[PDB]
């Protein structure tokens, strides 16, 4: 507690102007100081689970030395909406590593469902998260059904705090072996979908990797990231949003603004 919210930030005004709820957890991994706002509330994961999915595949590859190189063929029936990479390889197949990169860096839905199948489905990914000490995360459904973002529904949700804690374990801690850890970091660094979210608050001369989520309803969207400010320890953070009405729109600008407030609350001079 002593190092949580040392400096208050106007998250309440931000979410009120947005018309919904914003949840933020940010950890300075050097000092342990944190910024926390609605951090233990549940928010829909949307596509943000795909980062943890790729980490779970990497963990399995530590015991299967050839998993990542395995070529996966799939039929047209596997190609659900928003599969920008896997649709270009329908007639050829893709490797497990390539599907993992596509799921992370393009939020590819067909790739995500194929990898979920490899792990034993939503319960298998949930089990991986339990194995690293995350008791909050739950995945319940497949793409696209997991995006329903129904108010009060705990299916396919986690909390900003648990997302940040798990992301820290996987990218900076010991939950993955060192080669797999760096591969997960590199996939996050290569994400293409997050330029208007946490990255928009991060100076260009700092390294950053992220994974976005966008449910398409209930103003529900999110991003989590690891950030390496130069000259100090990395920061891990999660920013999740939702709103009360099905037709409410999400806002990338609100996510970027919340990330700025988190960095400011941690005293990390940047944006
Ligand atoms: B999941 O949240 O990420 C993808 C991409 N989302 S999006 O809002 O960036 N998008 C670009 C235009 C169409 C969708 C996705 C796609 C569908 C369902 C869930 C997710």
Swiss-Prot record:
<comment type="similarity">
    <text>Belongs to the class-A beta-lactamase family.</text>
</comment>
<comment type="function">
    <text>Class A beta-lactamase which confers resistance to the beta-lactam antibiotics, including penicillins, cephalosporins and carbapenems. Acts via hydrolysis of the beta-lactam ring. Has penicillin-, cephalosporin- and carbapenem-hydrolyzing activities.</text>
</comment>
<feature type="active site" description="Nucleophile; acyl-ester intermediate">
    <location>
        <position position="47"/>
    </location>
</feature>
<feature type="binding site">
    <location>
        <position position="82"/>
    </location>
    <ligand>
        <name>a beta-lactam</name>
    </ligand>
</feature>
<dbReference type="InterPro" id="IPR000871">
    <property type="entry name" value="Beta-lactam_class-A"/>
</dbReference>
<keyword id="KW-0732">Signal</keyword>
<keyword id="KW-0046">Antibiotic resistance</keyword>
<keyword id="KW-0614">Plasmid</keyword>
<feature type="binding site">
    <location>
        <position position="107"/>
    </location>
    <ligand>
        <name>a beta-lactam</name>
    </ligand>
</feature>
<keyword id="KW-0378">Hydrolase</keyword>
<feature type="binding site">
    <location>
        <position position="50"/>
    </location>
    <ligand>
        <name>a beta-lactam</name>
    </ligand>
</feature>
<protein>
    <recommendedName>
        <fullName>Carbapenem-hydrolyzing beta-lactamase KPC-2</fullName>
        <ecNumber>3.5.2.6</ecNumber>
    </recommendedName>
</protein>
<dbReference type="InterPro" id="IPR045155">
    <property type="entry name" value="Beta-lactam_cat"/>
</dbReference>
<dbReference type="Pfam" id="PF13354">
    <property type="entry name" value="Beta-lactamase2"/>
</dbReference>
<dbReference type="GO" id="GO:0008800">
    <property type="term" value="F:beta-lactamase activity"/>
</dbReference>
<feature type="binding site">
    <location>
        <position position="214"/>
    </location>
    <ligand>
        <name>a beta-lactam</name>
    </ligand>
</feature>
<feature type="active site" description="Proton acceptor">
    <location>
        <position position="145"/>
    </location>
</feature>
<feature type="binding site">
    <location>
        <position position="212"/>
    </location>
    <ligand>
        <name>a beta-lactam</name>
    </ligand>
</feature>
<feature type="binding site">
    <location>
        <position position="47"/>
    </location>
    <ligand>
        <name>a beta-lactam</name>
    </ligand>
</feature>
<feature type="binding site">
    <location>
        <position position="109"/>
    </location>
    <ligand>
        <name>a beta-lactam</name>
    </ligand>
</feature>
<dbReference type="GO" id="GO:0030655">
    <property type="term" value="P:beta-lactam antibiotic catabolic process"/>
</dbReference>
<dbReference type="InterPro" id="IPR012338">
    <property type="entry name" value="Beta-lactam/transpept-like"/>
</dbReference>
<dbReference type="GO" id="GO:0046677">
    <property type="term" value="P:response to antibiotic"/>
</dbReference>
